[PDB]
Amino acid sequence: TALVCDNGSGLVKAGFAGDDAPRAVFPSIVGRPSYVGDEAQSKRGILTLKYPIEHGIITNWDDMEKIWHHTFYNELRVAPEEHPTLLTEAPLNPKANREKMTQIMFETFNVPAMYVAIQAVLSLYASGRTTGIVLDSGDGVTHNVPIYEGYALPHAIMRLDLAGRDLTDYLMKILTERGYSFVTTAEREIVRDIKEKLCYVALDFENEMATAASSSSLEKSYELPDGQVITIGNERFRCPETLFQPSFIGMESAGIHETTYNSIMKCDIDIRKDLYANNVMSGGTTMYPGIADRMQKEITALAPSTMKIKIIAPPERKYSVWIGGSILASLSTFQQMWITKQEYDEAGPSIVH
Amino acid sequence: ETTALVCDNGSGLVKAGFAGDDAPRAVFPSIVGRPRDSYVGDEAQSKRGILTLKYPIEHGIITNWDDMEKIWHHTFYNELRVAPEEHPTLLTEAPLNPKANREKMTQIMFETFNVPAMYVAIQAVLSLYASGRTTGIVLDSGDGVTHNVPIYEGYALPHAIMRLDLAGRDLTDYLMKILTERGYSFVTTAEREIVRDIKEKLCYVALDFENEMATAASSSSLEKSYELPDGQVITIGNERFRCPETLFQPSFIGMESAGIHETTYNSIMKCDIDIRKDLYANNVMSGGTTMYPGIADRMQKEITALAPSTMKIKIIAPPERKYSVWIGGSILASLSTFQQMWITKQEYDEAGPSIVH
Numbered sequence: 001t002a003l004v005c006d007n008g009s010g011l012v013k014a015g016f017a018g019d020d021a022p023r024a025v026f027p028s029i030v031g032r033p034s035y036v037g038d039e040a041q042s043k044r045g046i047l048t049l050k051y052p053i054e055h056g057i058i059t060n061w062d063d064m065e066k067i068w069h070h071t072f073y074n075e076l077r078v079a080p081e082e083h084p085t086l087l088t089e090a091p092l093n094p095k096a097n098r099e100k101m102t103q104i105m106f107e108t109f110n111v112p113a114m115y116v117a118i119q120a121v122l123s124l125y126a127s128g129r130t131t132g133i134v135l136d137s138g139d140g141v142t143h144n145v146p147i148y149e150g151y152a153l154p155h156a157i158m159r160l161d162l163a164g165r166d167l168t169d170y171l172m173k174i175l176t177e178r179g180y181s182f183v184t185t186a187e188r189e190i191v192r193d194i195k196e197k198l199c200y201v202a203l204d205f206e207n208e209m210a211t212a213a214s215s216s217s218l219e220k221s222y223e224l225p226d227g228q229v230i231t232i233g234n235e236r237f238r239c240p241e242t243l244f245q246p247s248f249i250g251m252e253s254a255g256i257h258e259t260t261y262n263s264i265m266k267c268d269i270d271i272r273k274d275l276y277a278n279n280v281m282s283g284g285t286t287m288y289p290g291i292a293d294r295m296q297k298e299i300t301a302l303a304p305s306t307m308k309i310k311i312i313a314p315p316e317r318k319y320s321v322w323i324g325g326s327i328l329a330s331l332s333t334f335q336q337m338w339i340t341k342q343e344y345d346e347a348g349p350s351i352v353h
Numbered sequence: 354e355t356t357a358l359v360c361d362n363g364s365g366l367v368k369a370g371f372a373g374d375d376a377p378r379a380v381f382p383s384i385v386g387r388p389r390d391s392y393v394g395d396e397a398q399s400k401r402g403i404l405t406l407k408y409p410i411e412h413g414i415i416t417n418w419d420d421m422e423k424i425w426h427h428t429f430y431n432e433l434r435v436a437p438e439e440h441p442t443l444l445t446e447a448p449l450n451p452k453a454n455r456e457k458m459t460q461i462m463f464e465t466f467n468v469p470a471m472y473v474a475i476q477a478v479l480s481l482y483a484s485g486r487t488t489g490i491v492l493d494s495g496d497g498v499t500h501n502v503p504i505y506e507g508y509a510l511p512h513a514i515m516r517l518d519l520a521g522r523d524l525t526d527y528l529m530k531i532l533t534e535r536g537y538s539f540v541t542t543a544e545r546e547i548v549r550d551i552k553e554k555l556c557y558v559a560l561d562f563e564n565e566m567a568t569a570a571s572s573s574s575l576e577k578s579y580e581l582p583d584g585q586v587i588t589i590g591n592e593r594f595r596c597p598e599t600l601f602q603p604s605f606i607g608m609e610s611a612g613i614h615e616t617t618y619n620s621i622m623k624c625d626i627d628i629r630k631d632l633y634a635n636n637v638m639s640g641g642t643t644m645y646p647g648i649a650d651r652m653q654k655e656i657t658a659l660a661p662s663t664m665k666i667k668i669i670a671p672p673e674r675k676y677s678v679w680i681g682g683s684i685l686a687s688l689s690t691f692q693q694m695w696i697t698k699q700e701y702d703e704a705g706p707s708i709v710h
């Protein structure tokens with residue numbers, strides 16, 4: 001059985017091709033007083049943590065190996081030399097980076113075969129399409145990736161360094177401004193939970209602010225680990241509003257609607273209608289209730305007055321990259337695409353592109 | 354680019370829409386009402402008290418062609434707002450639907466509705482496709498009927514199909530009955546709709562029924578509150594799981610029949626020894642009456658107890674399974690390799706009714 005390993009900036013998602021979900025989901029962290037993932041989390045108080053995947057790109061290769069070794073031996077309990085292994089990489093991952101990933105897989109782990117797929121392309125596949133534009137928003141990075149018949153269009157790809165971890169930090173900030181105190185790393189973990197549980201994207205931000213200001217209809221309660229119950233009001237929607245107004249955290253970037261539009265505008269005029277009609281959301285930071293409807297409204301306002309816009313937001317989009325890899329690796333038509341160890345031994349580094 | 358239509362004709366509900374969509378656009382009651390000319394679906398339902406209601410699709414099989422025509426007409430003109438002469442139309446049928454029945458469906462589509470092309474698929478087969486498989490065994494439990502349909506390389510195996518005349522309508526009826534034991538009163542048609550809502554929202558399948566009963570008797574941890582349309586709040590305890598337990602124990606409603614785990618096993622045993630392993634590893638749940646939380650794990654456990662001690666058992670229960678028949682039809686009718694398989698008006702004219710098979 002082939003393995004699928006989706007290396008995220010915050011979370012590793014890993015499992016077996018043919019399964020409908022990753023068997024293992026754990027943090028992409030390595031800790032020293034070494035420990036990986038959950039074992040590093042459970043010893044948080046005495047460890048210093050490193051994140052080898054920085055904004056989607058692998059930057060610390062020694063620690064990345066530790067993550068991969070942990071994935072195979074501790075999480076999946078497999079010998080890597082026995083399984084073809086599909087790995088994922090960020091949009092615009094440098095060629096040398098991909099080559100190094102490949103070298104480690106073949107030379108350190110001795111995999112019999114491998115393949116490296118672009119994350120957003122796999123999410124597109126998981127939605128049953130080969131043409132469209134993906135918004136992939138994760139923990140450390142957000143990308144817009146337009147794709148034509150399987151090919152990610154590199155000149156049109158946009159990277160935004162605003163994602164899940166920034167939204168968490170911003171919710172800590174504004175909850176504290178309300179009169180709580182969320183500051184410490186343990187308090188960050190609590191706020192991350194509040195974010196995932198109680199936040200949403202308002203269809204109209206100014207209206208939603210007025211509603212919250214006049215009544216308590218939008219309020220929710222939340223029980224802290226120690227039992228103290230607290231109240232979340234307009235923070236519920238001001239937090240993910242940041243995606244649409246990066247100025248909220250002092251960033252000058254256009255918001256996710258405008259970056260989607262700008263990305264489409266960099267593509268060949270003749271494919272743009274297909275992109276607008278096939279906008280797919282993916283990644284954990286696209287999970288906010290209300291996001292698909294807000295994106296529909298926002299892109300309609302930017303796009304030619306006639307254009308047909310469609311947002312696709314799968315329920316399982318926090319795992320759609322992984323799912324796409326699971327589908328792909330299961331196709332009989334894909335089996336000729338694996339890069340084998342024999343092939344790499346002869347052809348060398350070059351073969352992976 | 355011409356859109357194809359997908360119409361999934363259920364015992365209780367029509368599911369209808371456009372091939373390529375991820376969900377049916379229209380979902381409405383399979384009812385035709387006439388003054389005590391005719392009303393269909395939601396309007397027939399909302400006008401009950403002045404109409405006589407008919408249900409033309411008994412236990413999955415179309416029994417009244419005049420009324421079924423009215424349903425299809427309403428589906429095209431009122432729900433989907435399409436001229437049927439302009440769209441290839443995929444229709445669905447029950448397991449073991451008689452050949453003359455499929456031929457009648459086809460004759461109506463071509464001669465009354467003037468569809469340019471059409472296809473008829475077995476409902477359970479479409480749900481299998483929707484789960485990404487062409488071999489497996491489907492448990493399809495709807496409003497009026499439940500079937501086990503084993504399928505090998507895309508074809509249902511008729512000799513091994515099991516039909517159980519127990520489904521969603523009976524569970525609703527049984528929940529009303531057991532709620533009455535508590536002193537509640539659910540008698541009217543409006544009251545039955547409230548019980549249907551309670552069932553759909555609060556019911557679940559116990560992993561171990563006798564243990565669940567003990568838990569419910571010794572603690573209030575399984576109880577849920579439900580607000581009635583008139584503001585009154587009632588309490589639901591062990592009725593949450595006694596209701597769908599009926600699926601595993603049809604004696605709860607006085608049926609001598611085997612439960613759904615046993616029919617699944619019996620169905621598999623009617624198939625070639627050489628395919629059984631594949632069937633056990635690909636048991637797909639479909640239909641609204643398979644939606645109860647806990648059903649997959651209980652089925653896994655019961656089938657494990659019945660099957661040879663080595664056997665590898667896997668239950669697939671898609672989140673969207675109340676629509677998976679429709680969804681499979683949407684996918685199939687969207688495929689480039691399916692386009693040849695449409696029966697066109699010309700092929701029908703040249704070959705006669707037999708071509709639909």
Ligand SMILES: CO[C@H]1C[C@H](CC[C@H](C)[C@H](O)[C@H](C)[C@H]2OC(=O)/C=C/C(C)=C/[C@@H](O)[C@H](OC)C[C@@H]3C=CC[C@@H](C[C@H](OC)[C@@]4(CO4)[C@@H](OC)C[C@@H](OC)[C@@H]2C)O3)O[C@@H](C)C1
Nearest residue numbers: 125126127128129150327328333334373374375683684687
């Ligand atoms: C390296 O480079 C490649 C290039 C290429 C990649 C192939 C890729 C991995 C995938 O294999 C495909 C994309 C495949 O898609 C799949 O295999 C899987 C698809 C899934 C779960 C789709 C759902 O997300 C979808 O829900 C929203 C279901 C939903 C429900 C009802 C209607 C449908 C409508 C859908 O078009 C929206 C489709 C028409 O049915 C559609 O998908 C069911 C059909 C489907 O071929 C059966 C796709 C054609 O939509 O090949 C590789 C070999 C090498």
Ligand SMILES: CO[C@H]1C[C@H](CC[C@H](C)[C@H](O)[C@H](C)[C@H]2OC(=O)/C=C/C(C)=C/[C@@H](O)[C@H](OC)C[C@@H]3C=CC[C@@H](C[C@H](OC)[C@@]4(CO4)[C@@H](OC)C[C@@H](OC)[C@@H]2C)O3)O[C@@H](C)C1
Nearest residue numbers: 018019020326327330482483484485486507684685690691
């Ligand atoms: C009239 O006679 C026919 C006979 C035949 C019908 C074909 C049918 C309509 C379908 O087109 C296919 C069954 C097709 O399946 C599909 O088109 C659609 C599939 C979907 C939404 C699957 C999900 O439900 C699934 O979730 C649980 C996703 C999930 C996620 C991860 C991994 C996968 C694992 C899956 O094997 C479980 C597969 C390996 O990926 C699988 O399906 C993604 C691949 C898939 O080909 C891309 C199927 C091969 O599992 O042809 C017609 C032309 C004529």
Ligand SMILES: Nc1ncnc2c1ncn2[C@@H]1O[C@H](COP(=O)(O)OP(=O)(O)OP(=O)(O)O)[C@@H](O)[C@H]1O
Nearest residue numbers: 008009010011138139140141164196283284285287
């Ligand atoms: N239901 C939810 N609502 C809001 N945010 C969520 C939800 N679920 C997860 N997230 C956020 O999604 C992020 C993780 O998503 P994902 O697994 O797609 O990221 P990654 O792949 O690790 O990061 P990247 O793609 O940036 O490298 C976390 O910031 C998490 O808090």
Ligand SMILES: Nc1ncnc2c1ncn2[C@@H]1O[C@H](COP(=O)(O)OP(=O)(O)OP(=O)(O)O)[C@@H](O)[C@H]1O
Nearest residue numbers: 363364365366495496497498521553640641642644
């Ligand atoms: N979430 C749920 N939990 C339990 N039961 C449900 C749920 N949702 C729907 N049902 C029941 O499912 C039944 C309808 O399912 P479905 O649409 O598959 O049936 P159908 O195709 O009309 O009938 P049949 O297949 O018997 O001809 C109704 O009895 C309904 O109450």
Ligand SMILES: [Ca+2]
Nearest residue numbers: 024025026038
């Ligand atoms: Ca985990």
Ligand SMILES: [Ca+2]
Nearest residue numbers: 181183184187
């Ligand atoms: Ca503190």
Ligand SMILES: [Ca+2]
Nearest residue numbers: 379380381382
């Ligand atoms: Ca409806």
Ligand SMILES: [Ca+2]
Nearest residue numbers: 693694695696
């Ligand atoms: Ca034909």
Ligand SMILES: [Mg+2]
Nearest residue numbers: 008009119138
């Ligand atoms: Mg990611």
Ligand SMILES: [Mg+2]
Nearest residue numbers: 363364476495
């Ligand atoms: Mg049905």
